[PDB]
């Protein structure tokens, strides 16, 4: 059921939240996941996607599921991010790109004349016992947050 496998360590990974706490994938035992990797807080559509996510916050929770976002940006960039955009769920603090790396989201791309990485917005669905179960690579905003949740009600039934 696995559509990729993650190193063992990276449910260890200490994940800096906005708000100043800590969490681990494995923390999160026992309920649905859903990872979203977005390349910058604040901008047009990393807002637009986190606005998405957070209007169907109840529709994740009636299947118990939790969403976390990540990016790369500081933990006080996340928090102005999530007080400014009236966000309920947390976003990681992926500073060092530990986690990026685990889920391969940090590509390259030949521009300028040169080898250029960054983040490619993603996401993925992680299952009660820590199984990426769906995933989404280069994803457009529009219709994502809808197809997420539409994904996750019929994995979870
Ligand atoms: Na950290
Ligand atoms: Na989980």
């Known amino acids: 059921d696995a559509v990729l496998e993650l190193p063992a360590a990276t449910f260890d990974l200490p994940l800096s939240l906005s708000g100043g ?60 991010f999530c007080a400014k955009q009236g966000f309920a769920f947390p976003l990681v603090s992926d500073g060092d790109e530990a986690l990026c790396r685990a889920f391969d989201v940090i590509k390259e791309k030949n521009m300028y004349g040169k080898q250029v990485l960054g983040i490619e917005r993603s996401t993925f669905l992680l299952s009660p016992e820590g199984q990426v179960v769906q995933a989404w690579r280069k994803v457009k905003v529009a219709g994502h947050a809808d197809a997420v949740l539409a994904a996750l009600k019929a994995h979870a039934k």
């Open 21 to 80: 706490t800590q969490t681990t994938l494995r923390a999160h035992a026992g309920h649905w996941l859903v990872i979203y990797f977005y390349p910058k807080d604040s901008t047009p559509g990393c807002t637009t996607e986190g606005l998405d996510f957070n209007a169907l916050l109840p529709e994740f929770d009636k299947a118990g599921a939790k969403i976390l976002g990540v990016s790369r940006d500081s933990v006080k960039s996340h928090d102005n």
